[PDB]
Amino acid sequence: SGFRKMAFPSGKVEGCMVQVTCGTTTLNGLWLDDVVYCPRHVICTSEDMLNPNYEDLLIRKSNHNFLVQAGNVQLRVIGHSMQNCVLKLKVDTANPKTPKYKFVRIQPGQTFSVLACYNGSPSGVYQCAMRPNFTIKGSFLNGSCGSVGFNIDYDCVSFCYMHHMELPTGVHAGTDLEGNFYGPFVDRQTAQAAGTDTTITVNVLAWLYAAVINGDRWFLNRFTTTLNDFNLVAMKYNYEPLTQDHVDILGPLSAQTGIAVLDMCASLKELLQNGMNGRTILGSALLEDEFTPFDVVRQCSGVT
Amino acid sequence: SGFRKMAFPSGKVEGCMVQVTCGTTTLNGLWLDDVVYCPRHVICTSEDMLNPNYEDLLIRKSNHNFLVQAGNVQLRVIGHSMQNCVLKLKVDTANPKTPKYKFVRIQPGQTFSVLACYNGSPSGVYQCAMRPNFTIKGSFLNGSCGSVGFNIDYDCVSFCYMHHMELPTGVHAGTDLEGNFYGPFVDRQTAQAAGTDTTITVNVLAWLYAAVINGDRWFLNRFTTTLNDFNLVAMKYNYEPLTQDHVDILGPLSAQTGIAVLDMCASLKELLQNGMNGRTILGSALLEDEFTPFDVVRQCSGVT
Ligand SMILES: CCNCc1cn(C)nn1
Numbered sequence A, B: 001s002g003f004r005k006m007a008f009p010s011g012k013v014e015g016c017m018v019q020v021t022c023g024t025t026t027l028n029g030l031w032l033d034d035v036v037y038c039p040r041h042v043i044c045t046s047e048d049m050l051n052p053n054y055e056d057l058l059i060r061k062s063n064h065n066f067l068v069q070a071g072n073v074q075l076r077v078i079g080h081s082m083q084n085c086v087l088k089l090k091v092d093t094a095n096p097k098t099p100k101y102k103f104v105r106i107q108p109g110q111t112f113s114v115l116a117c118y119n120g121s122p123s124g125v126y127q128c129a130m131r132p133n134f135t136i137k138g139s140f141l142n143g144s145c146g147s148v149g150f151n152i153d154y155d156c157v158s159f160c161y162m163h164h165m166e167l168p169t170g171v172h173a174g175t176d177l178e179g180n181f182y183g184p185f186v187d188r189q190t191a192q193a194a195g196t197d198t199t200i201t202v203n204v205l206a207w208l209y210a211a212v213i214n215g216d217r218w219f220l221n222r223f224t225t226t227l228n229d230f231n232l233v234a235m236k237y238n239y240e241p242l243t244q245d246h247v248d249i250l251g252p253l254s255a256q257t258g259i260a261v262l263d264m265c266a267s268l269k270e271l272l273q274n275g276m277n278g279r280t281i282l283g284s285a286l287l288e289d290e291f292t293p294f295d296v297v298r299q300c301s302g303v304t
């Protein structure tokens, strides 16, 4: 019993982190096979960052300018290329600790683990969600860029995020491992404001199911609703619309608990309209939206 | 910027987890050097668990009854002993992945990371606090026993917890790595009720400092207080008394923010008396008490 915000075990990713230095900028790289992946803004002077031309900046760079250190050993860079907003540094040594891996681009509402690193050294691991506005609410200090987000399917690491940017509002922006930003963000020190940070409704419902499974049931009411009626209330509270696809995904939790998804929607509707009245659910005073239905099933079933 | 409930990178501990089987019971062991540490209740039939005599049960056990598997390879058990509530299985092979390590017994209010494991395989990592009533609020299913709690100081893993028990109220009890239970709990399926789960005041204050550092300042007020005045209010709200030792420990956060500890106590006093009025602090609607002052300094400074 019990339900925690749980990250994937980080060891397989710890084995991939290296330090990348270009001039006076040090950040983190991801070493998979004989390629080190890092944010292309490693080549920028904080001045450059105001209006950088990456293709022009890169003409001034040679392989030997990219200093890559794996623990206390230097890697030899034998080539470099820019793909979207990431650099790919080809090194002469395959990472011997390379796990089975994939690069995936996640959807808003999907969760992942972040291994926060500084100077290629892991500092901690925490669980994130891609927000509906394509920001993440991370914990990143200067030097943390190139830290990565991932999911693990048994022995295969799916890398989904690389950290690039903090917005003036202290939320985070980054790329998939093909170097494509999530959302409208760019690797430039400019006015970038996030859109509405809506609540990931299907994740809240998942977490309410987690609550029932773990004996927190005070919020269960006598009501039901419809997708359309629920969605009118969701919209009013800046919740993401619930689709039949979401209902289908919650089916297994529905089955396990015997609470119809639309009944749980009617519980959530009353929580939105009435608040928590100073009560908690799974030790939270707000409705948690950074567990997916898959997360709740995984944690409630003990997958390794 | 940003502040997350962050666990230590788990890789050094992942390298230590093994499966221990005695008859039909499989749980987790910790393999350090040529010793596997596991809960002694591995020898119990769920029946045994009602009133177990461990010394008598152990007379019926031989080395060859303890099946220890590290990944898909069997370890040879060449001796076993009981220390308090843990078994020490001596194996013929030193764990080649043994990190620098210590066994420490933590105090209530101290935080640590848990690597939740099943069949010797890591499932996730999360951050816990030893509660003032010597329970922890974990995420543990059947098979999770022998999962461990730890802190990391650069390259040295301090092991502080091994998971043994779920209480009827779904909170968790376990031992240090010398096999001594935290609190009054025993490895018997009997009436064990936890005492008052008080709030770890010094940790709340630490987290309020974390909030100010990260730009959440709405709760800062014009007031101060005294340790004695604050403690009268703390007692009323089932908060742990604040000592001068706690004030001393918060000194560095005081210095960094220029908010005197007693001023922050007066902010916390108003939050207790007035509530949050539907506002959040670092994305929480309740006062978080599972960050130590050391945690806040570490995360706010980016220690690896
Ligand atoms: C535009 C990316 N090509 C740069 C380069 C040059 N060399 C020798 N290796 N990589």
Ligand SMILES: CCNCc1cn(C)nn1
Pocket: B058, B063, B078, B079, B080, B081, B082
């Ligand atoms: C009471 C603990 N001693 C048990 C034992 C017996 N052998 C051969 N190895 N360990």
